[PDB]
Amino acid sequence: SEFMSSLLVKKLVESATTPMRGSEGAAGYDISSVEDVVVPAMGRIAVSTGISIRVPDGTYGRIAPRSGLAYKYGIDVLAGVIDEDYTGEVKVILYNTTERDYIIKKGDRIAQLILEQIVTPGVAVVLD
Amino acid sequence: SEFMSSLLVKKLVESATTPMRGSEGAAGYDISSVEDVVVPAMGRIAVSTGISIRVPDGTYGRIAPRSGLAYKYGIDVLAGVIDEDYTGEVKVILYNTTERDYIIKKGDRIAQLILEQIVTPGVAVVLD
Amino acid sequence: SEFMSSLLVKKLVESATTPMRGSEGAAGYDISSVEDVVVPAMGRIAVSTGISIRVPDGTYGRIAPRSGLAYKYGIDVLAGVIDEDYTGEVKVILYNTTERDYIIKKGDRIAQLILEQIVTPGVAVVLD
Ligand SMILES: O=c1ccn([C@H]2C[C@H](O)[C@@H](COP(=O)(O)OP(=O)(O)O)O2)c(=O)[nH]1
Ligand SMILES: O=c1ccn([C@H]2C[C@H](O)[C@@H](COP(=O)(O)OP(=O)(O)O)O2)c(=O)[nH]1
Ligand SMILES: O=c1ccn([C@H]2C[C@H](O)[C@@H](COP(=O)(O)OP(=O)(O)O)O2)c(=O)[nH]1
Ligand SMILES: [Mg+2]
């Protein structure tokens, strides 16, 4: 591959932001919003990222929560499992744990992508 | 092993469903319920899967949320860490984020199993 | 490395507990509290662990929920992503899903650390 076994990103909207790690030791690639939305108090919402992704073979893309938002605004990430064979747009489902709404302006880093190494064997069913 | 390093599944109840990936690129193996239960609004519940599993060495089984259920019914997965040395029955703890109960009929895919590769070294305690 | 590619732990407070797996097949290293705190009903809180950690290269440290606490007290773990380049103190953000507060005495195992293998390639942006 030379290195086509990396994170293939395709911006769908011009407004989109290329995912990027914020440190040499960072685990995930920052993931920003492409729209202005409000995560309802005690409610959820799916934020468009405006990008599609192709995870490296042997891994899946887990949308994990950013420490900041979790801490300060009790924001959590629901679902978050992006299959290697997913060609659609990455949507980020946020859940407001707090009693007060949460504002999201375009461009904001609303989550982070982690390329988690998984194993995808077959199922050996044990009879007796 | 030839391939005994795959997902060993043992149905405990005849009603059980063998976990299975739904795509070539899917990350997890579908996980169905073996009973009819209701996930209480704003409450949780542990759904029996009726199966026991033996994860491949070098990984653990993370019970992750299905995108659909998360999106449409604000259903989330609590706990979800199945150790390689777990011989009991896989129980799936679902949490209803919504204001309205959620019905689960036997056979339904209530979560997905992901064989996540972990490293299990020893702890090197740094003194001074 | 010989084996300096293991979980490097540095107790910050004498009161701290060295993370440790509770089984040969356990996926995570137990993580205890270093203080007496209360996880507010329907609220969150960041529990100090009194330790700093250096994850092995090629992985990140995911703070996962303990099955017990999740089941019995509807306790969940928010955020939970500790980067390999994190030199600060591991803080554990717990979220009380239940209607009743949750007490945490010093020494208690409040979560578990899982050294999850990730891949950290570069981003190949697909133009046209
Ligand atoms: O539950 C958690 C989650 C994260 N961290 C630490 C690990 C990581 O190295 C650091 C990340 O801070 P940040 O990512 O630089 O700020 P942000 O999450 O807003 O990007 O916080 C914790 O101690 N506990
Ligand atoms: O937060 C999420 C979770 C999943 N997906 C995408 C990735 C995956 O490829 C697809 C999965 O749809 P599905 O699994 O086929 O439907 P279901 O989750 O009900 O099995 O949804 C997102 O965009 N955002
Ligand atoms: O959603 C879950 C989470 C865990 N387990 C199983 C897998 C694991 O092998 C066992 C762990 O029990 P424990 O870790 O020994 O008790 P505790 O979580 O309090 O440490 O529970 C489940 O069946 N379902
Ligand atoms: Mg939650």
Numbering used by the authors:
A (entry chain A), B (entry chain A), C (entry chain A): -2 to 125
Question: Can you provide the manuscript's text about this entry?
Answer:
dUTPase (EC 3.6.1.23) is a ubiquitous enzyme that catalyzes the hydrolysis of dUTP to diphosphate and dUMP, the substrate for thymidylate synthetase in dTTP biosynthesis. The 141-amino-acid deoxyuridine triphosphatase (dUTPase) from the algal Chlorella virus IL-3A and its Glu81Ser/Thr84Arg-mutant derivative Mu-22 were crystallized using the hanging-drop vapor-diffusion method at 298 K with polyethylene glycol as the precipitant. We previously generated Mu-22 dUTPase by mutating two IL-3A residues to the corresponding residues from PBCV-1 dUTPase. The presence of these two mutations (Glu81Ser and Thr84Arg), creating the derivative Mu-22 dUTPase, led to an increase in the optimal temperature of the enzyme to 328 K. Here, we conduct structural studies of dUTPases from Chlorella viruses in order to elucidate the molecular mechanisms behind the differences in optimal temperature.
